[PDB]
Amino acid sequence: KTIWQNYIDALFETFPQLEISEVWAKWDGGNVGDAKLTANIRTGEHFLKAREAHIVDPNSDIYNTILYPKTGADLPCFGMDLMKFSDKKVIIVFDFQHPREKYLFSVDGLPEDGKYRFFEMGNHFSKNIFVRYCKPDEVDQYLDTFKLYLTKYKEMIDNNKPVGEDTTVYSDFDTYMTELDPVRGYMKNKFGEGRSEAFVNDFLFSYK
Numbered sequence: 395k396t397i398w399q400n401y402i403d404a405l406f407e408t409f410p411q412l413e414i415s416e417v418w419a420k421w422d423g424g425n426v427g428d429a430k431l432t433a434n435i436r437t438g439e440h441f442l443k444a445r446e447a448h449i450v451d452p453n454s455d456i457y458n459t460i461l462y463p464k465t466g467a468d469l470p471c472f473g474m475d476l477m478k479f480s481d482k483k484v485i486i487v488f489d490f491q492h493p494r495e496k497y498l499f500s501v502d503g504l505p506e507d508g509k510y511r512f513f514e515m516g517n518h519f520s521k522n523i524f525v526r527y528c529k530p531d532e533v534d535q536y537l538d539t540f541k542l543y544l545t546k547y548k549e550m551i552d553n554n555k556p557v558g559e560d561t562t563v564y565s566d567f568d569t570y571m572t573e574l575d576p577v578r579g580y581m582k583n584k585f586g587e588g589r590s591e592a593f594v595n596d597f598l599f600s601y602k
């Protein structure tokens with residue numbers, strides 16, 4: 395059972411071609427394990443990969459997924475970080491994440507964002523970065539907006555039909571995310587340092 399189930403459903407209802415090609419990890423961890431990690435690789439028409447991490451424990455439920463489109467049409471990735479940290483607190487982030495360094499991407503008609511702790515806005519995050527904070531029982535209030543972002547992304551995929559498989563397009567992007575993403579603290583704590591290292595470098599941001 396996950397509070398993110400309707401977001402997850404919407405994603406795969408939009409892109410039903412994204413089927414599991416590799417289960418990269420199913421790990422136990424946390425307290426004596428109360429933490430579980432599932433890391434899947436999915437592939438399908440017009441995508442290089444969709445890499446999906448889902449970490450659950452008694453207090454938290456994190457769904458971290460990036461759709462890497464096929465290269466050749468200068469399309470952004472679609473990224474999400476849906477984090478429940480406790481019974482009282484969640485953060486929802488999703489965005490069009492463009493692989494070009496210091497390149498402003500936007501989709502006119504979408505909400506526009508407004509500074510954050512860790513990343514650099516406008517650099518692999520778009521003008522339409524969507525970040526909200528709320529209670530777990532409140533997450534579906536933003537589902538319709540998420541569905542609009544999915545609709546726009548499906549439109550760009552369907553209209554451009556990229557076919558390239560040049561993973562080096564994503565090198566700067568995966569390098570930036572590796573450098574800046576605050577995933578290491580949580581991961582080491584629950585799973586150990588070698589597993590943390592592998593998860594970040596060989597699964598999350600492996601195109602460096």
Ligand SMILES: C=CC1=C(C)/C(=C/c2[nH]c(/C=C3N=C(/C=C4\NC(=O)C(C)=C4C=C)C(C)=C\3CCC(=O)O)c(CCC(=O)O)c2C)NC1=O
Binds near residue numbers: 474510578
């Ligand atoms: C798997 C483990 C995992 C951990 C431990 C994790 C932690 C994590 N991500 C964060 C922020 C964030 N995370 C993102 C975005 C992303 N980050 C990504 O890895 C991707 C793909 C995006 C795509 C949109 C952004 C923009 C913030 C800053 C939010 C903020 O400052 O409130 C924060 C700061 C939240 C805050 O203080 O408000 C933490 C602790 N995210 C995780 O996924």
